[PDB]
Amino acid sequence: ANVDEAILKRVKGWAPYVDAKLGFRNHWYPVMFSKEINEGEPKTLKLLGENLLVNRIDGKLYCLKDRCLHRGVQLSVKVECKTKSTITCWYHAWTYRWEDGVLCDILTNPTSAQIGRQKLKTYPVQEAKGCVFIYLGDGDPPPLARDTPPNFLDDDMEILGKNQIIKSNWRLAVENGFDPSHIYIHKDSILVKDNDLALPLGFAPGGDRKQQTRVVDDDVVGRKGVYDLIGEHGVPVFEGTIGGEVVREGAYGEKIVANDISIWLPGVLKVNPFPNPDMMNFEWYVPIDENTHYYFQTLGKPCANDEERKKYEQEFESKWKPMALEGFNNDDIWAREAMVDFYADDKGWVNEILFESDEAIVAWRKLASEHNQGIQTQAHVSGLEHHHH
Amino acid sequence: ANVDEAILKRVKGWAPYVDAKLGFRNHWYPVMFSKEINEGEPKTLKLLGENLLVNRIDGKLYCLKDRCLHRGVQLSVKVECKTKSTITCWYHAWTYRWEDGVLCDILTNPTSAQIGRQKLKTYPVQEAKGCVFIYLGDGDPPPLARDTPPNFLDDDMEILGKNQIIKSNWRLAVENGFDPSHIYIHKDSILVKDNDLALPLGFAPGGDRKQQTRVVDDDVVGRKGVYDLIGEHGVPVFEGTIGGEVVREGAYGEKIVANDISIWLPGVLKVNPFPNPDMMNFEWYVPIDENTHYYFQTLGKPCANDEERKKYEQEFESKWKPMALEGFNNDDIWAREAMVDFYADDKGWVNEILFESDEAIVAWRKLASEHNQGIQTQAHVSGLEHHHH
Amino acid sequence: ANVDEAILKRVKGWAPYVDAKLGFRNHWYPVMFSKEINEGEPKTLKLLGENLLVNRIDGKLYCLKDRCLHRGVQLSVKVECKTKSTITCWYHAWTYRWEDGVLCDILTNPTSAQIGRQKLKTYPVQEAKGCVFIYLGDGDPPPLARDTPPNFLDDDMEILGKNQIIKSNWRLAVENGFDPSHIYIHKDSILVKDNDLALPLGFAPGGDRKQQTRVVDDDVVGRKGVYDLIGEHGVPVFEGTIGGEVVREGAYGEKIVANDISIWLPGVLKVNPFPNPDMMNFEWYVPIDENTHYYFQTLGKPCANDEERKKYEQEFESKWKPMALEGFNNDDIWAREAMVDFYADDKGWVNEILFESDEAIVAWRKLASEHNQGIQTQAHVSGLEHHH
Amino acid sequence: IWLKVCAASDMQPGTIRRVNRVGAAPLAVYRVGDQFYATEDTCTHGIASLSEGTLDGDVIECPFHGGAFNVCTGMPASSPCTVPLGVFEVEVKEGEVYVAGEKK
Amino acid sequence: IWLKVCAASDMQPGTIRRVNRVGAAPLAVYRVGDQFYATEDTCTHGIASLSEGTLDGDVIECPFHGGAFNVCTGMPASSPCTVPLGVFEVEVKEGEVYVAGEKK
Amino acid sequence: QIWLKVCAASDMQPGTIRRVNRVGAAPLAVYRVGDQFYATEDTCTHGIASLSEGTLDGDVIECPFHGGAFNVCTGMPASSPCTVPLGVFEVEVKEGEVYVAGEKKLE
Ligand code: FES
Numbered sequence A, B: 001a002n003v004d005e006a007i008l009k010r011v012k013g014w015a016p017y018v019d020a021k022l023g024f025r026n027h028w029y030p031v032m033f034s035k036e037i038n039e040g041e042p043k044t045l046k047l048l049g050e051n052l053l054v055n056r057i058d059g060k061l062y063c064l065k066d067r068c069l070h071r072g073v074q075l076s077v078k079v080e081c082k083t084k085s086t087i088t089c090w091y092h093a094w095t096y097r098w099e100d101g102v103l104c105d106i107l108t109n110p111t112s113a114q115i116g117r118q119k120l121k122t123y124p125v126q127e128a129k130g131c132v133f134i135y136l137g138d139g140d141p142p143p144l145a146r147d148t149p150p151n152f153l154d155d156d157m158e159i160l161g162k163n164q165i166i167k168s169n170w171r172l173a174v175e176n177g178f179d180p181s182h183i184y185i186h187k188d189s190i191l192v193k194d195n196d197l198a199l200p201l202g203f204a205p206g207g208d209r210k211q212q213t214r215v216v217d218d219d220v221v222g223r224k225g226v227y228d229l230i231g232e233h234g235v236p237v238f239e240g241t242i243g244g245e246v247v248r249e250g251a252y253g254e255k256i257v258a259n260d261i262s263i264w265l266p267g268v269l270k271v272n273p274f275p276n277p278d279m280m281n282f283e284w285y286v287p288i289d290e291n292t293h294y295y296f297q298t299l300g301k302p303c304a305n306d307e308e309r310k311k312y313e314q315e316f317e318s319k320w321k322p323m324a325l326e327g328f329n330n331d332d333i334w335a336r337e338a339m340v341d342f343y344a345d346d347k348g349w350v351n352e353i354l355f356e357s358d359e360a361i362v363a364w365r366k367l368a369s370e371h372n373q374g375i376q377t378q379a380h381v382s383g384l385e386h387h388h389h
Numbered sequence C: 001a002n003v004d005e006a007i008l009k010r011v012k013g014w015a016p017y018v019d020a021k022l023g024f025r026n027h028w029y030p031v032m033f034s035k036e037i038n039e040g041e042p043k044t045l046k047l048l049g050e051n052l053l054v055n056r057i058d059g060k061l062y063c064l065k066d067r068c069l070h071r072g073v074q075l076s077v078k079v080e081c082k083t084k085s086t087i088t089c090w091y092h093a094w095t096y097r098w099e100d101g102v103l104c105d106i107l108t109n110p111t112s113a114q115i116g117r118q119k120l121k122t123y124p125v126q127e128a129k130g131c132v133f134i135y136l137g138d139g140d141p142p143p144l145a146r147d148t149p150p151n152f153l154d155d156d157m158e159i160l161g162k163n164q165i166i167k168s169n170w171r172l173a174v175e176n177g178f179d180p181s182h183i184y185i186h187k188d189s190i191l192v193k194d195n196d197l198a199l200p201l202g203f204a205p206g207g208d209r210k211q212q213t214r215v216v217d218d219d220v221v222g223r224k225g226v227y228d229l230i231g232e233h234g235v236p237v238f239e240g241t242i243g244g245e246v247v248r249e250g251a252y253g254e255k256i257v258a259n260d261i262s263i264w265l266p267g268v269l270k271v272n273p274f275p276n277p278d279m280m281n282f283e284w285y286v287p288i289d290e291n292t293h294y295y296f297q298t299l300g301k302p303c304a305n306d307e308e309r310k311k312y313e314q315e316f317e318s319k320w321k322p323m324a325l326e327g328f329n330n331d332d333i334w335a336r337e338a339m340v341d342f343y344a345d346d347k348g349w350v351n352e353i354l355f356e357s358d359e360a361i362v363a364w365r366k367l368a369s370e371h372n373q374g375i376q377t378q379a380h381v382s383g384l385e386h387h388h
Numbered sequence D, E: 001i002w003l004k005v006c007a008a009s010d011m012q013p014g015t016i017r018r019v020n021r022v023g024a025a026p027l028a029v030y031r032v033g034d035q036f037y038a039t040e041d042t043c044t045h046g047i048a049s050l051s052e053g054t055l056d057g058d059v060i061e062c063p064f065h066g067g068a069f070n071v072c073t074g075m076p077a078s079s080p081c082t083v084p085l086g087v088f089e090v091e092v093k094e095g096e097v098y099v100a101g102e103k104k
Numbered sequence F: 001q002i003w004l005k006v007c008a009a010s011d012m013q014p015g016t017i018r019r020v021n022r023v024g025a026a027p028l029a030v031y032r033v034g035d036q037f038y039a040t041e042d043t044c045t046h047g048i049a050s051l052s053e054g055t056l057d058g059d060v061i062e063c064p065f066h067g068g069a070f071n072v073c074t075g076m077p078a079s080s081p082c083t084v085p086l087g088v089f090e091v092e093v094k095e096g097e098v099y100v101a102g103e104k105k106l107e
């Protein structure tokens, strides 16, 4: 639907994934932090190509599509919330309820037959761990846990992080994140020295194909993902050689980290333990449009009370955020961007020459193709098209 | 021709209009004011996607297509008018007469067989009311009166105005201007308050839809247009309510304006009287290319003598221009721009959800579709194409 | 393959040429000057749409495609030359030899089955007259002389020049250069006056079509090109008229120049003698992508010793470069840019209305169409495709 | 409770007939074969008159944007339409078509 | 006035022959089946020789840009040609091809 | 040793593929085209795909990953993006028993 049929026909093992250029519909996605949206102050954002508006009323979040039903203008061009529970389009005053999107009034013509007979698209919104999740889908939403990695929602798990827009398709961000051998680009990260980490340069695989990963599709919660087990039978590379001569060495620090990595639909990575032996790293690559994504980074650390929460918060600002989220992950950002040209014409999905560790990426592509809840299409963006027969 | 055939097939009520992305060929269009072009100073512009050159020789205006017949370069890159009646291409010196566009000489080869056997496209140009009109069409032009609103050419009518380039397709401009309910965007205009105008928030229609408009299929000079009669049997709305609560009020001024509003092909609106009970407002939305148009604004007021003309010009510069042409119409500009995305992929022409007052727009779309004198195509811009034998 | 088939069908006399929007594959192309590439200092460039990396090792030049075989990233984003004879991708450490492109090591997995079983594309590189030529083609390359105009490689011919990226398709640059009548745009060049040049405004052709040019396809070194012979039977134009009245005159200087003009595949012009009666001007219009090209300008003057070479170099820097390469040729740059719009949609190749002197351009279009060594396609850029 | 439309003979199969009602919105009567159906005349997607549309079987296509509805059920058949059309009862008594002034 | 061009049999069916005229523009003589026609040889859109073009019925296609003309009327048949070709009536008498001296 | 016992010729239907795993070595793929047998490395030279999981069309095997293909008899590429030839291993049938070479042929 989104890609030349000749290409989809070639990638028989994961065509749905290759076709999912706009992301997967019917999944929850984090788009901002709770503290970024204030009471009565609608905020705009684009998710899966759709312009949305989020507002907080009586502390609860509501989401309406930011596109008037009438002439298709963004209501946000000139926000007019004239009553607590509604928003009035600045153009011809069509008024909608945040609660159900129903066109309840039209100031330019209170006798219009459209009143009460049209409805603006709304999307479920849920806040968890100080993060704002939007269910970009149709029908009643599944539990949030289904689209989050294990432990993210733990009661004692304190979540902190940052978010930003990155210029690359979401899939390139995902594959880079789950890529076992990309650890090489982190060899000079400040976190390595400054946090005394043990970090190999790569991995010499061991065992059979099936042993390289653990595909999860029997999670009682419904979670669908893959675990990277390359380290279970492999031999970590600490001395890189060329022509038999050592030209590079891994990091021989004491802190053991990132020995438990997994990727979960709709596209969230869990690195454990990281950036420190007593922490976890959860990062989402949320589709904005075919060329961009939100790089939603979160770090979690169990905290029994305000005491620890405050301390954690302090270290997050002074150390973890600058040394890890940025000092470590920044290289991930330009790495993703570096793959844009090769895959931009969709040809990269055919011409890529993979090697052993990409077995982890293949497992993900297959899992995503088989368990996604829907392929977002441009028609979903402009307006579904069909001619029942 | 210019739109997906699948879309044109759907809009049976006005396919030609939807197809007219580049504008209607064979109509007169104002592009600048007479004072903007002086004797012997060629001026460039783009109209209906075509690059044009206008020059004033012995007081009379002439228009040539700004594209050499030889290698297609714009003559204007380096203007060489070596004799009062001609223009020489800077590249290989092909020389054309402004009067008829004939290739009368070629300095680089005076023996060329092309001399006298080729003709650069010329377009009729006429100055009226200090405005420069170009007939972007083929063959003998019809009277200018056909493409101008009633009274614009009245002997005593004194015309003053402003012109600029706006980033939106010309049709979005036309529809916004003739939109009966768009008056809502002007509720806070400085003109309404500073000129004590009565301005409702909209209208509750009355009578049959047939009574909502008055189509003029022909008049003394072949004019084609539509009058907005929503206020004839409609009820002006002065109190905007939501859930029964009053949240906004119209303006209760004593000056009654805009009792007569009409749109005419090729796309010029007449508002009478406006912005004052003794004046008229005539505004064109001229197609430059598929994404932009000239917003050619004019205000007219009958003047019997030089004394009145001077007084009017003073009032225009000190009040009407900044308070009306700018203070009022600037909101029309951004409303216009807000509709670009929805119609940019041509899908808005199918997905829009219209309501009662839009009968005016529908009437215009059908009138435009039935009586335009030609659909400008990209082939007109590059060179008409036809193949057979 | 690059242009609408309906258009190609219309230009039966030179369809291959019109389709060659990305240039001709399997030809040598100059891309920079020798002094611009230093030992162990990799340089990036795009040629015929392909991103390339050039490096100098032990003095010799090597050229590798700047695109890792693995995930298609440019190695140049972060160059890692761990050893003198190899380059390691910054992403997963696939390491290639500059000499043959062989994937010889992979630091992230020394046991990988890909090691020694993949090869990154390499292209022949040759330095001549201080110019770096890359053979953007496949298989063993032909002698460089085949793709260079006559005398460029002469023993004593000292070559100096300038190079830059220009925003126009390479063909517009070629046609403007070999265009007999475009001489009109140079009528006010500072070179005309400052170097006392004789320069007509144009030419009134004489004789039949075949006499307007000399198509060269019998050259022993295999070079293919066309000589502009419009001046052998014509009548130079020195008095430009409109309605029979003189409105402009040519230049009546003493120095006779540019009466020996020829264009050669893959797209290099030779103007002789120019800009002075004892010099030659050789310029290439190298395809970078569909919209841009390198304007590789060179001026050659015979020099017998190091002493004369230095003299020439100084004159080049103080006079020839600013007065000719820039003072004269700068008008060629915007002239070619002015034709972009008309040909950008490929419709100009159909709608153009040609006149007599264009016989030279037509001759070139036909020569190029018949003797080019291959049409570069977008598939060559992304990866050749073929279904069993 | 019922309004007199026309004689079953006045409508050729596959045609549409608009029924204007005083002080009320218009209705549309369609003859699909030998059976008659009725719905509100105004397309739920805008202000178009469905009686000015094209009937194909039991599906009416709106002249404005190509949206469509099943005239029997009133359910949308083609995008962009999404809101069900109001359906009215029809009776053919004594070779004459009658439409329920009230929607079922 | 008339110019003796050649013997009808000198031209195979569907072929074109260029006729040079000292101190004048060359002409093109076309043989369509057993009929003969003539026009100016130079395409009106450029410098191409129509005698080096492709004849399809009574329409000559220019070798340069695919423009075309009807060789009987001289009117353009395909873009980009827009200027009509000069036509010269021809007469075949005793197996000899004659072409009018001046355009007509 | 030199010849690896694969299976009985009868255990393979025309147009099928069988994967042969070797301890301390890369897997092979045995193809039956009609009543003749051929063999190549099982791993696609263009990546990490298993050709034994692909589709055999005559004497051409199509890789399941990207659609590349090879001629099973010669091992030469048949469809892009494949460009590196497959190592071919001789196969012989002794007493209705299929045997594949332990070392690839050299050319
Ligand atoms: S576009 Fe929102 S009310 Fe008209």
Ligand code: FES
Binding pocket: B068, B069, B070, B071, B072, B073, B089, B090, B091, B092, B093, B094
């Ligand atoms: S492009 Fe104008 S004379 Fe050649």
Ligand code: FES
Binding pocket: C068, C069, C070, C071, C072, C073, C089, C090, C091, C092, C093, C094
């Ligand atoms: S992209 Fe170069 S080693 Fe992976």
Ligand code: FES
Binding pocket: D043, D044, D045, D046, D047, D048, D062, D063, D064, D065, D066, D067, D068, D079, D080, D081
């Ligand atoms: S008004 Fe009927 S489909 Fe839009």
Ligand code: FES
Binding pocket: C350, C352, E043, E044, E045, E046, E047, E048, E062, E063, E064, E065, E066, E067, E068, E079, E080, E081
């Ligand atoms: S020269 Fe004949 S069609 Fe252009």
Ligand code: FES
Binding pocket: A350, F044, F045, F046, F047, F048, F049, F063, F064, F065, F066, F067, F068, F069, F080, F081, F082
């Ligand atoms: S792995 Fe077989 S074609 Fe790519």
Ligand SMILES: [Fe+2]
Binding pocket: A176, A177, A182, A183, A186, A329, A332
């Ligand atoms: Fe990373």
Ligand SMILES: [Fe+2]
Binding pocket: B176, B177, B182, B183, B186, B329, B332
């Ligand atoms: Fe307005």
Ligand SMILES: [Fe+2]
Binding pocket: C176, C177, C182, C183, C186, C329, C332
């Ligand atoms: Fe030049």
